[PDB]
Amino acid sequence: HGKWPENNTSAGVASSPTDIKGKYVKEVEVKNGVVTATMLSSGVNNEIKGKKL
């Protein structure tokens, strides 16, 4: 389609990001191609809880 997908629905993935998730990951959103992933809460003490990649 010649441009980065804004969002999940366009990317062709689970339209809700939260549905896409990990054991310690909260969600995964498409953001104009850039794939942001949000971490869960506890499961570690570490300064990641709810943080993003």
């Binding site: 570690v44 003490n45 570490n46």
Partner: protein, 53 residues
């Protein structure tokens, strides 16, 4: 006359019974206090293990 030789015995008889016994039941305590600590050694990493994960 010899009695002062007996005197000095009964001065040796009344012993101190050094505080280096009860300071070292307190440090014999430090031995088995350490025996409690050496238990704690196992939990150091296990408690940590929960704390980190």
């Amino acid at each position: 006359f010899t009695l002062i030789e007996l005197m000095i015995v009964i001065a040796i008889v009344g012993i101190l019974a050094a505080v280096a016994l009860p300071a070292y039941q307190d440090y014999t305590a430090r031995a088995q206090v350490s025996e409690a600590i050496l238990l704690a050694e196992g939990q150091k990493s296990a408690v940590t293990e929960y704390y980190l994960n």
